[PDB]
Paper text:
Second-site mutations PA [name] and [name] D253G were selected during passaging of the recombinant WSN virus with a PA [name] mutation and conferred elevated FluPol-binding to the CTD as well as to huANP32A (grey and blue bars). PA C489 is in close proximity to the phosphoserine binding site in CTD-binding site 2A. Indeed, structural analysis by cryo-EM of Zhejiang-[name] WT FluPol in the symmetric dimeric form and bearing the double mutation PA [name] + [name] confirms that [name] points towards the phosphoserine binding site, although at a slightly greater distance than K289. Despite this, the structure did not reveal CTD-binding to the Zhejiang-[name] PA [name] + [name] FluPol in this conformation. Therefore, we speculate that the fact that CTD-binding is not restored in vitro for Zhejiang-[name] PA [name] + [name] could be due to strain-specificities and/or to the presence of cellular factors that favour binding of the CTD to the PA [name] + [name] and are missing in the in vitro assay.
The viral RNA dependent RNA polymerase (FluPol) is a key determinant of viral host-range and pathogenicity, and a prime target for antiviral drugs. A direct interaction between FluPol and the disordered C-terminal domain (CTD) of the largest RNAP II subunit is essential for ‘cap-snatching’. We show that the CTD, jointly with ANP32, enhances FluPol replication activity and we demonstrate in structural studies that CTD-binding to the FluPol is consistent with replication activity.
Numbering used by the authors:
A (entry chain B): 1 to 183, 207 to 633, 658 to 670
B (entry chain C): 42 to 138, 227 to 248
C (entry chain A): 202 to 716
Amino acid sequence: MDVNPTLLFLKVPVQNAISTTFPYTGDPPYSHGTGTGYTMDTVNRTHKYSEKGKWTTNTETGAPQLNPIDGPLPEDNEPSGYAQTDCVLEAMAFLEESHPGIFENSCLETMEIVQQTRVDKLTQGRQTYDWTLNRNQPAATALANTIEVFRSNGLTANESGRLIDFLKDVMDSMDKEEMEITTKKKQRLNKRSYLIRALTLNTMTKDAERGKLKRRAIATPGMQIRGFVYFVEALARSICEKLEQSGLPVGGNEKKAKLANVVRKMMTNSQDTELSFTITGDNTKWNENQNPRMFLAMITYITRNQPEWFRNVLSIAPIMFSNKMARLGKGYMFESKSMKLRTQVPAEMLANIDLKYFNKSTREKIEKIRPLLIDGTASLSPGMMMGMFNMLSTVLGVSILNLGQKKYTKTTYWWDGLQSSDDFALIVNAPNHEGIQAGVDRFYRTCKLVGINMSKKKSYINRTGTFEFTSFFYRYGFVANFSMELPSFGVSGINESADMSVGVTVIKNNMINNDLGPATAQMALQLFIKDYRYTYRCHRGDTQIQTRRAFELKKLWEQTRSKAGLLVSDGGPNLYNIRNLHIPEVCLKWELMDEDYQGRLCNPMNPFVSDAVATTHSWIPKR
Amino acid sequence: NPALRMKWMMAMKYPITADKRIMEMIPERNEQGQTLWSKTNDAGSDRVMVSPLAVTWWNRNGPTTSTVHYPKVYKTYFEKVERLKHGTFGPVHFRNQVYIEVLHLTQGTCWEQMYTPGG
Amino acid sequence: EERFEITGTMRRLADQSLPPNFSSLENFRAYVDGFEPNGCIEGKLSQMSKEVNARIEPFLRTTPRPLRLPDGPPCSQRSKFLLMDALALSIEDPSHEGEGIPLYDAIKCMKTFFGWKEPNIIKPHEKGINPNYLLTWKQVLAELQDIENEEKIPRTKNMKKTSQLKWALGENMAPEKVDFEDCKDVNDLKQYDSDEPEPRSLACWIQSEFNKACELTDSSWVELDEIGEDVAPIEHIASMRRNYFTAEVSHCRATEYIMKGVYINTALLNASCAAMDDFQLIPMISKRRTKEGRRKTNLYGFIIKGRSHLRNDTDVVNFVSMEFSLTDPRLEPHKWEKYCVLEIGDMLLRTAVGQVSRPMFLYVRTNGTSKIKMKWGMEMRRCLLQSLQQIESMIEAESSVKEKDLTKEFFENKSETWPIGESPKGVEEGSIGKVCRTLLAKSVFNSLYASPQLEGFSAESRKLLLIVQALRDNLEPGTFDLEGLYEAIEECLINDPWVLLNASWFNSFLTHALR
RNA sequence: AGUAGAAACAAGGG
RNA sequence: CCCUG
Ligand SMILES: [Mg+2]
């Protein structure tokens, strides 16, 4: 006999045992070296799909730019970026018609949030790009540096503490003739240098990613674009909240409801002689085909009949994104085997350097990208490198989905489905197979007219009843969720009392959201208990394990009358269970402690002190 | 990673930091001779280094004070345990899919548990 | 009230962010304001060519074909420690110490063997200097004996920086770091070699490894804590499931692998982070409980760890590992490409045939590891967790169809056997316990042999699995482009033996499913 | 030598 | 010899 878990599918359907196809117990892949190669490859590919556009020279920054909008229609099945303005505007108009009043309400809510917001929101975020030090810094430090540098020159319009005032200061600084920065040392940058710095993205390789063989490059913006992007995302979220087909920004409790709702809507109304089919598929090169000019057109159409200031503040972001620059990155590394040397070549020298060092592929990339470099960075006008517009693209996809109603199709077949950024699922109803094919072709062609490309390698069609959507596996009404990786239930490492509550809350939250089963929850609780006991050395009182604290724990255990009231930190028993994962420990056993023991435990004059309950165990460890 | 950092920190002799009056309440040596605190002072402050054996000694040997107030201030937490203790459970029903607080135990992926709180 | 005016520079920037044949931002806004839709999409679709379409290719029982595997020399073992060939020297420690010094345990375990002899090399390492390994082994023995002649017994033994340890731990192999200005005029200056892995073909040893990983032992390798009393019926069912699984899976070998790896990685990480500039010695120790409930401590071998000046999460630390065993290396030599094997002793075993004098070999190998690999290997226990979920999920699914729990119908029924293996006479069916052991073994091996190729293969084969399942469900499947999927699946089978084994499993399942 | 895989580690500065 | 992981 030769064991073979795959053969297990011969009895139980695949969707019932899909968890066996996720290898999420090893270390995820990482990247060693620089992300310059990936960045150059991404830039070249982004410029490849729009080769038949209009080339121009920028008057302010001086770098070449490419504009494929309204270009020649596509001919073959290769990815395309020529999005037609008329088609996009028509799709937006029809989406507005189908849901009257959506844009007005979204604009009102966005205006309210713009009025109310505050600068402090910029502090919460990932590692941003700091242009004062030309590096990557946490949001708070970068914001502090930028505000200090702004105040060095005369700029005091953001003292009111409103984000819009900060944006006004940024815009005014853009028009300043010279910018001075402190390093003690000082430096001056003219208009062009500061402008190029303000329109720069920092690129690096993405680490710890599953489901892919080869690495990828992702980008992060500066500080002058964050606020406008935040406003645009607020507007997009407000619009998406009112859409039934949008898969964002919901959690994991109603997504199954959404799937069942769509299936029942597209099945129940069907007669007894109507064919229904389901397509599950992805979108290819989603981020490298969305032109910021189309986003500007969409934002202009959305905000019709509005105050001028609102239109300007909302439409600034596409303008900046359409004139962005990409930093090549760390550079390359050279090795001399004959003389045993190693050296580093910074990216700044890639523009002017002999190509005898590099191999074929790197030399070709350098040659292709050379005409674009300016001041050590590459112009990237077309495409969205990192896709911070995660919700406007969803709105566009949902508009295309809506475009397939029975009214607009004007034919026997019809369709509808679900969309979430890159992923989508479709259901097509028609009386024959010819109708099914016609509907599929119409959807594909209409999608191509806007710049949305469907992946033919990761997509398949079958009879409706079973499908998949963002790792939610639907089969005859039963939906399984596998879109989240199981964490390690260990000790956080703060205190004896913080760790208990933190771990119990982690288990409870995983049980609630990510659909953790009961038995797995009990086993996780047992493993965490073992780890906690072996970390803090607070073993049981009757256990015969020898440790530094053994004597004190045994004496305390012997003193007490009711052994069930002792905390797990004092060698007590374990009382937690599934029904108790919400009660804090001290309040869980309060009616089971001794008078003197519970008097000493919560002593307010103890020297150690000065969801959780203050006790003798809340101490501060040494640095 | 803080987890391994504390794993290593707990292996030392005196990983905890306390004030200076601790020396007046708990003794320097156990009933078996184990040390509980050291004369060395913390860097940047007047604190002193203390070992978890001091925490256990205080818990099992230290002044006692009435804790009548604790249930009053933490009334919300105690109400939850009272309601859980006095509640009544029911049969499990496997079917297709004051109450919200226990939501993690009543509902499930494909099962339902009958629950009425005892308050 | 609100005043946000676009200035000159911003106006000049925005005048160039519009579609073509538009002059200024005001003109674009005016055009968008007065836009009314009429026959735009229909026209553009009319002008399009007919080559832009999505034809559906039918899927039938004769359509799919087996995957293609690479060719080359057979794959070789690439784990941090031996799995099937391991042997341990065992003693008893009735004084339950929570965490004692492992060096003394190692010495006490060593002192129970009275069959040492003069080592020699029988299976050499082709690309390395063999005598250095032998010198390293003799040096470790000499240091262990030197431990006796000391005023005070130490807790850790730092090996002397000898020539053989300098070579084995790759000392002074990094080139010198200079700037680009000085060494620009050199004939052999280029960038590093960015090539692809060299392909290898599947071998038969990994199947045997997996088979032996799914077997039972005569000891207990896991001990878990307690939980509260079960009052709700849901808790009763949960406890029943958990207890049945734990009973069926606690005597498996995969648990031994989990504990062994956890201990080794924990020791390595602590040693690397504590003693940065010393050549530390770290033994391999594990704890078990016999069938009678009597504790035992096993020793597997030794490792020596070199300089550990690690900065990032991918910096490498080298070490040298020596392990005991009884597997004759001259039976599957291609499995031991990177090992140097010495015959160090003569053991004697006792069985039905009486007493047999077997030889005792030592496997010596130079390896390396990063900080992230060690961090992710200290938490192999989660494998257990994962396995449980899998089993439980099945029942949950099987319950929803019939609206009734089937835990007892799954575990205690002593029937309803699952097809889990393959045999020449046909498919083989096993009980639930075999299924639990199989899933635990699969999870453990997924943790042991992690690599990006495995992730790619799994992600790209899931879709083919689902398509085949839909075909078996007579739902009339159809693919827009099937060959691209096969290319994406096959692009990830290069080097890993685990991925090649998974591909072979997929081929066998595909053959059996469409029959 | 070894880890590893499209670019790096196999210690760096004074 | 010092500092840094
Ligand atoms: Mg999908």
